[PDB]
Amino acid sequence: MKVMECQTYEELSQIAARITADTIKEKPDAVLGLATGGTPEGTYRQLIRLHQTENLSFQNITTVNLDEYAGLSSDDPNSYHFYMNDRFFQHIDSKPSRHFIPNGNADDLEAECRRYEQLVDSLGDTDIQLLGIGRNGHIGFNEPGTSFKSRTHVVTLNEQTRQANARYFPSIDSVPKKALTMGIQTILSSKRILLLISGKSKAEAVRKLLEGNISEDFPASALHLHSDVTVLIDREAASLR
Template identity: 50%
Template sequence: MQIDIVKDYDILSKKAAQIISAQIIQKPNSVLGLATGSTPIGTYRELVRMCKEGIISFADVVTFNLDEYYGLDEDDPQSYHYFMREYLFKEIDIKDANAHILDGKAADVEAECRRYENCIKEAGGIDLQLLGIGQNGHIGFNEPGENFEALTHLVNLHPDTIRANARFFNSIDEVPTQAITMGIKTIMRAKKIVLLANGESKAEAIYQTLKGKITPRVPASVLQLHPDITVIIDEAAAVKL
């Protein structure tokens, strides 16, 4: 495990984008696992810049997003389909067919989960998975107590996660209570993982992830077992290390 502690969010974002861009340059048809939330926005901004400047191209890149709220249409401004279009996809040269996101309105959720797993397998597996981390240590929407063996599945969101995400909605009552997410086992199958965290609110989760026991109560702690992971955190998120 490589741990990079950087001064601030701007440097964090640039370092993450450099790792992802290097992956694309080395393998133009890379399969990337992508995250949402506020943490990767700066990274996506850097990747957009690199693409527009001709440093990298997403023409042959395939992407799979970690998760999607269950019950939201893809055109809902709070859906992760919408998030990815706004912050990345509409600004780069990726093919629509190569950008995969779970269907939050799937009538048969189990079938949608199986389809997604099959798509990842057919693409050759994820070369690089980008992750953020929740204040309770969740990755994707794998909440505390989730089985490490889970593949893509439907989850009930923890009240802490609902409260944390309420800032993106008009009220907490609008936050979906379920989501479809890649499971821990799916995430751990990625060849390389990059975990990002910024801000003191993530400090305890980072401490438990990197220094604590490996336990489903801190889902991200399983990342200690991954053979190729880079953790990039700012000084505020590193205060307890």
């Protein structure tokens, strides 16, 4: 696991965008695994800037997202479909049909998860997977106690996760209770993992991650099993290391 300490969130975001662009340009038709939340927002902004300043083309890319909330339609402003379109897809020259995200408004959520797992396998897995980390070590919405063999599945969100994400909702009472997420094994199948971590709130998780103990009680510790992980950490997140 290669750890790079970044002086600022802006530097983190520039570095992450550059690694992502490398992936896009390394081969005609890359498959990118993407993530939402606060942490990658700068990375998306910088990727869009590269589209303008370095003539970066997304014409041939395919993407897969980590997760989606259960019961939210794609036009719901808190859906991850909406996030991805707003922050990224609307601003680039990709083919919209090659952006894949779990359907939180499928009739049968268990069946949707099986079909999504099958879709990801059929793409040949990802060339890179962007990740964030929860305060509790979660990756995707794979909470403490998740098997390292897990595949795409329906989960019940921990209270800490709903607490953290309420900032994006009108109130806590609007935060969904369940989500669909790529599993840990799904994530580990990527060729390359890029874990982004920012802010003092994640300083406890960074400490635990770098110490190297492996247990299902800290999901991100599964990344110690992968052959090509880069972790970008800004100064605030590195403060309790």
